[PDB]
Design a binder for this molecule. Structure first.
Ligand SMILES: *[C@@H]1O[C@H](CO)[C@@H](O[C@@H]2O[C@H](CO)[C@@H](O[C@@H]3O[C@H](CO[C@H]4O[C@H](CO[C@H]5O[C@H](CO)[C@@H](O)[C@H](O)[C@@H]5O[C@H]5O[C@H](CO)[C@@H](O)[C@H](O)[C@@H]5O)[C@@H](O)[C@H](O[C@H]5O[C@H](CO)[C@@H](O)[C@H](O)[C@@H]5O[C@H]5O[C@H](CO)[C@@H](O)[C@H](O)[C@@H]5O)[C@@H]4O)[C@@H](O)[C@H](O[C@H]4O[C@H](CO)[C@@H](O)[C@H](O)[C@@H]4O[C@H]4O[C@H](CO)[C@@H](O)[C@H](O)[C@@H]4O[C@H]4O[C@H](CO)[C@@H](O)[C@H](O)[C@@H]4O)[C@@H]3O)[C@H](O)[C@H]2NC(C)=O)[C@H](O)[C@H]1NC(C)=O
Ligand SMILES: *[C@@H]1O[C@H](CO)[C@@H](O[C@@H]2O[C@H](CO)[C@@H](O[C@@H]3O[C@H](CO[C@H]4O[C@H](CO)[C@@H](O)[C@H](O)[C@@H]4O)[C@@H](O)[C@H](O[C@H]4O[C@H](CO)[C@@H](O)[C@H](O)[C@@H]4O[C@H]4O[C@H](CO)[C@@H](O)[C@H](O)[C@@H]4O)[C@@H]3O)[C@H](O)[C@H]2NC(C)=O)[C@H](O)[C@H]1NC(C)=O
Ligand SMILES: *[C@@H]1O[C@H](CO)[C@@H](O[C@@H]2O[C@H](CO)[C@@H](O[C@@H]3O[C@H](CO)[C@@H](O)[C@H](O)[C@@H]3O)[C@H](O)[C@H]2NC(C)=O)[C@H](O)[C@H]1NC(C)=O
Lengths: 52, 127, 111, 51
């Protein structure tokens, strides 16, 4: 969702698989995250994969 | 003073789609917001959405989510819009119009100030 | 959409007056001092004649006095003539992230 | 000031406890910042230099 050349330091949209209140009914969810806070999972071409 | 132009009339069946185009002059294209409005035969005008020449971020009225669509380009300096699922009601004329000044450090998109207006776009639909 | 109230066609002879009220809800109209009117003159596209609730855009006599009344935007008109015949809309900020307007008041000036 | 109008997006995560996160951001994106008076900060520099 990235203004490709913006003079801006926007926060990122990603998702994740959430363990609901019952421990064996997993379900996905999403929420935004300020851009410094997340580290890419890998220094490779894993441009999708991200972690806190 | 600003020179503003719209595309001409258009003909479809009801429930079809329409496209509207707009391009200003007299100011550099990247400094002002762009809006659209529908002018009925006397019923209250419908404001549809606002457009940013810089970014792909736009919002639309509570009637029009999922129905309207919009794109723009910078090098040629043109604003585009597309509505789907027309009605017999929206034979009403559509007007391109210039919005408020753009600021990075405070928000001004929702300011309801229109200083320059077009000459109307009349889409036609009938049984 | 929540179209605002507007007296549809009240009018008088030259030198007479009308009153206007643009009522929405408690959430939209009076949140910011950002109200605009647009005059759909017959035979030509609308025209800009109210700004910032209490200011006129260009050089024009401030006859159509502006006033803030919270949930509804109220404005008083006086000193009209027969050539003032036109349809006047009122528009206001309407929350996340849009604007709403009224049904339009026409000055059906008589005589 | 932060001109973005952030909103909360609440999820229930784990038994009997709730996570909060920034929701769908309303309005056009703008950049956060601070503001300082150029005349007075320069004068204050002028007054500090003598010390
Ligand atoms: C933190 O910090 C930060 C900093 O960093 C910050 O920020 C900031 O803030 C502030 C406050 O808010 C802000 O301010 C704003 O501003 C705006 C704008 O700005 C500027 O600019 C401009 C420019 O111009 C442009 O446009 C035009 C149109 O408009 C055109 O024409 C031109 O041309 C331009 O364009 C483009 O192009 C070009 C080409 O060449 C280029 O070059 C350029 O560049 C561009 O791009 C200017 O002009 C302005 O000025 C003016 O105005 C003012 C006000 O009004 C005044 O005062 C001045 O003086 C001027 O004036 C003029 O006119 C007159 C007449 O008579 C004369 O006389 C003179 O000479 C001149 O000519 C500026 O400066 C603005 O806009 C705003 O204001 C507005 O609003 C208010 C309320 O709020 C009101 O009161 C006012 O009145 C206004 O309104 C108006 O205007 C608008 C637009 O502008 C419109 O819409 C409306 O309607 C009205 O209208 C009127 O007028 C017109 C004309 O103009 C006419 O036509 C009509 O009819 C009517 O009359 C404000 O001021 C700023 O901006 C910021 N910055 C940044 C960077 O962002 C912050 O804030 C802090 N924080 C916080 C929290 O806040
Ligand atoms: C910054 O971001 C925040 C969000 O974090 C945003 O705040 C939200 O703004 C929206 C407006 O865009 C607010 O939406 C309103 O929600 C109320 C909720 O109604 C319920 O709760 C009330 C009070 O508890 C009950 O009385 C009510 O019965 C409900 O249970 C809605 O009522 C509103 O809808 C009415 O008004 C709209 C116009 O404002 C109409 O479009 C809509 O159809 C409704 O009108 C109908 O009902 C009226 C009576 O209510 C009636 O008089 C009319 O004739 C018509 O029939 C509205 O959707 C939302 O609540 C805000 N959320 C919070 C947490 O504050 C900011 O706006 C945003 N700011 C900026 C500058 O971007
Ligand atoms: C952040 O990204 C996620 C996806 O990675 C976004 O959620 C997904 O958004 C899409 C597009 O709006 C949703 O698809 C739409 O669904 C409606 C259903 O009514 C359909 O009619 C549309 O044609 C479209 O397919 C999708 O459902 C949604 N995901 C979930 C699980 O609901 C999210 O919106 C992004 N957030 C921001 C702020 O951009």
């Amino acid at each position: 969702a990235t203004v490709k050349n913006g003079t801006v330091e926007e926060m990122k949209n990603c998702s994740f698989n959430t363990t609901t209140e019952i421990r064996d009914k997993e379900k996905k969810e999403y929420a935004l995250f300020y851009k410094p806070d997340i580290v890419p999972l890998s220094e490779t071409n894993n441009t999708s994969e991200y972690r806190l | 003073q600003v020179q503003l132009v719209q595309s001409g009339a258009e003909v479809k069946n009801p429930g079809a789609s329409v496209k509207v185009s707009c391009a200003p002059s007299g100011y550099t294209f990247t400094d002002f917001y762009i809006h659209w409005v529908r002018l009925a035969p006397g019923q209250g005008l419908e404001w549809l959405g606002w457009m940013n020449p810089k970014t792909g971020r736009t919002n639309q009225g509570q009637n029009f989510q999922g129905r309207v669509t919009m794109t723009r380009d910078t090098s040629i300096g043109t604003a585009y819009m597309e509505l789907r699922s027309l009605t017999s009601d929206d034979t009403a004329v559509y007007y391109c119009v210039t919005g408020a000044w753009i600021s990075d450090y405070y928000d001004s998109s929702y300011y309801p100030n229109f200083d320059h207006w077009g000459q109307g776009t009349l889409v036609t639909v009938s049984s | 959409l929540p179209v605002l109230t507007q007296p549809a066609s009240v009018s008088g002879s030259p030198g007479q007056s009308i009153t206007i009220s643009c009522t929405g809800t408690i959430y939209d109209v009076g949140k910011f001092d950002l109200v605009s009117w647009y005059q759909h003159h017959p035979g030509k596209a609308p025209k800009y004649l109210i700004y910032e609730v209490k200011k006129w855009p260009s050089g024009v006599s401030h006859r159509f006095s502006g006033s803030k009344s919270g949930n509804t935007a109220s404005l008083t008109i006086s000193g009209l003539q027969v050539e003032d015949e036109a349809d006047y809309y009122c528009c206001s900020f309407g929350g996340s992230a849009a604007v709403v307007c009224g049904g339009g008041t026409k000055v059906t000036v008589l005589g | 000031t932060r001109p973005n109008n952030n909103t909360r997006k609440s999820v229930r995560i784990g038994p009997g406890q709730t996570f909060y996160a920034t929701g769908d951001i309303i309005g056009d994106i703008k950049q956060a910042h601070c503001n300082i008076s150029e005349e007075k900060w320069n004068d204050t520099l002028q007054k500090v230099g003598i010390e």
